[PDB]
Amino acid sequence: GSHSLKYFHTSVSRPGRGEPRFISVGYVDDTQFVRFDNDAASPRMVPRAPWMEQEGSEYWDRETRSARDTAQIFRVNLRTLRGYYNQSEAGSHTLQWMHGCELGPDRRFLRGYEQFAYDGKDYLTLNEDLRSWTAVDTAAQISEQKSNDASEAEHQRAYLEDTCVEWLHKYLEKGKETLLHLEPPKTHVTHHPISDHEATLRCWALGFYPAEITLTWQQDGEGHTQDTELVETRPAGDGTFQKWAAVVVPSGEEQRYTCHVQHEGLPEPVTLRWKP
Amino acid sequence: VMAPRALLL
Amino acid sequence: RTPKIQVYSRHPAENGKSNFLNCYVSGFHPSDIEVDLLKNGERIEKVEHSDLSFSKDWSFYLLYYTEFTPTEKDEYACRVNHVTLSQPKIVKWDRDM
């Protein structure tokens, strides 16, 4: 079903230290697979997932070139961006760029996006129909009128509806082995006393993929957010993710509290409890 | 692959 | 606005068993950031980190990590400097979190 091809590009100017730094990271779903960094020992597009450790030199040279070229474009762009804002080379600035395509359950194009951000704030967005650009500012107007006039939407739309999709499929294929595997979370509940009156119940979800997951506590079979806490999902570092949910309970009421875990890799949602 | 053409702002 | 930080192991911590020490820094901007992993206040060497990426809100995120073997008495932390922090931010590893 659902799957996505996404890239995240960052360019950061260093004013008396040469050309700005340029990084590109590629994801298929929640799996990174390539990267380019013009500061790495090898300033080339390089594989970041096992199933790309084979790809011919041709793919790599192509991508190293594409990233390089963009670095240059972005170098010019950082200088232009500084004029729209009335900026000297005094400080360093960031141009961000993201784009991706998403397939619906049928394995076909469902949505594409692309945007630009300057110094962390939205600057230019491709519209939802991929036909034109919107200055998400009024200082980005020149950029909007210039890209709408030169008909630049069209090249991005081709990439996002075709190329990106085509390639999304090659990558799934190259990595079907692991990319389509749904690793369910190893769940368990731990007990951490706070005092004689209360203690913390912590419900653990570990080693799962994809990152999407839902942890909730219930008390006596009712939704329960009072004295609840949920951490952001984090990467285990091995490709999988982690997450935990916490609820403050009175001594001897623990068996009233059940944790529920929803994940795409579980045949059905799991219900947990502290075994004492 | 990544997008082949990056806008000049 | 300011960088969020989480310190944790890759695998459930068990004394004397080799593991991985993670410091997931995220929610920050700009991208220059100084992240050290400490062993008893002593900066650990040769720590690696993921490629720079970012969320839909443009804020960046990194995973710093290093091999490590947890003792009952050894202590580890993550010290983070960033322009948006008036002082270097420090969170210590709690194997319970």
Side-chain angles (χ1 to χ4, degrees), chain A residues 67-118:
Chain A
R68 279 193 178 151
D69 287 338
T70 307
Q72 284 283 177
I73 297 290
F74 274 35
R75 189 190 64 61
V76 175
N77 282 333
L78 290 162
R79 186 178 79 200
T80 307
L81 287 161
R82 244 168 40 221
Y84 299 142
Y85 297 93
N86 305 309
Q87 296 163 156
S88 64
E89 287 183 276
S92 94
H93 300 273
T94 307
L95 179 56
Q96 286 172 282
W97 179 37
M98 70 183 182
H99 62 74
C101 62
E102 293 176 23
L103 306 180
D106 52 26
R107 297 316 173 73
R108 294 186 279 67
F109 176 78
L110 168 57
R111 149 170 178 275
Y113 63 90
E114 195 175 309
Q115 358 185 177
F116 294 91
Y118 183 50

Side-chain angles (χ1 to χ4, degrees), chain A residues 39 54 75 77 80 143 148 166 168 176 185 187 194 196 207 214 240 242 256:
Chain A
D39 270 13
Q54 77 295 328
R75 189 190 64 61
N77 282 333
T80 307
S143 291
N148 285 338
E166 287 139 84
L168 181 39
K176 50 191 157 196
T187 63
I194 302 176
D196 308 314
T214 305
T240 62
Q242 311 180 347
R256 275 178 47 191

Side-chain angles (χ1 to χ4, degrees), chain A residues 61 67 82 215 246 257:
Chain A
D61 303 322
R82 244 168 40 221
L215 298 175
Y257 296 82

Side-chain angles (χ1 to χ4, degrees), chain A residues 8-10 12 25 27 32 35 48 96 115 117 119-120 122 192 202 204 232 234-237 242 244, chain C residues 4 6 8-12 22 24 26 29 31 51-54 56-58 60-61 63 95-97:
Chain A
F8 295 88
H9 308 281
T10 310
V12 175
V25 292
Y27 291 92
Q32 190 198 328
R35 87 92 193 289
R48 293 312 316 274
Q96 286 172 282
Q115 358 185 177
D119 288 330
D122 280 344
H192 313 269
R202 183 124 63 221
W204 296 77
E232 304 204 331
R234 39 159 110 146
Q242 311 180 347
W244 62 248
Chain C
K4 289 177 289 197
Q6 299 188 62
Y8 55 106
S9 50
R10 179 129 99 182
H11 307 296
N22 295 327
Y24 185 57
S26 66
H29 202 289
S31 70
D51 296 311
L52 187 64
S53 186
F54 57 82
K56 144 157 64 167
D57 67 353
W58 301 116
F60 298 100
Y61 66 81
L63 186 51
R95 80 176 62 193
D96 287 324
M97 295 184 101

Side-chain angles (χ1 to χ4, degrees), chain A residues 193-209:
Chain A
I194 302 176
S195 75
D196 308 314
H197 315 52
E198 307 159 321
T200 302
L201 280 184
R202 183 124 63 221
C203 193
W204 296 77
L206 297 169
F208 55 98
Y209 184 101

Side-chain angles (χ1 to χ4, degrees), chain C residues 9-73:
Chain C
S9 50
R10 179 129 99 182
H11 307 296
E14 186 202 305
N15 284 312
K17 305 296 185 65
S18 161
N19 213 313
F20 277 89
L21 179 54
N22 295 327
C23 188
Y24 185 57
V25 188
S26 66
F28 67 98
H29 202 289
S31 70
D32 299 306
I33 192 168
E34 181 194 333
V35 178
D36 295 299
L37 275 48
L38 323 172
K39 176 180 194 176
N40 293 150
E42 296 304 292
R43 192 251 172 184
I44 299 177
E45 290 287 310
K46 301 155 80 279
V47 178
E48 293 158 308
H49 70 84
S50 66
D51 296 311
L52 187 64
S53 186
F54 57 82
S55 308
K56 144 157 64 167
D57 67 353
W58 301 116
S59 72
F60 298 100
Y61 66 81
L62 292 167
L63 186 51
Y64 287 78
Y65 57 102
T66 181
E67 303 183 64
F68 92 117
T69 289
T71 303
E72 184 190 44
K73 52 199 162 28

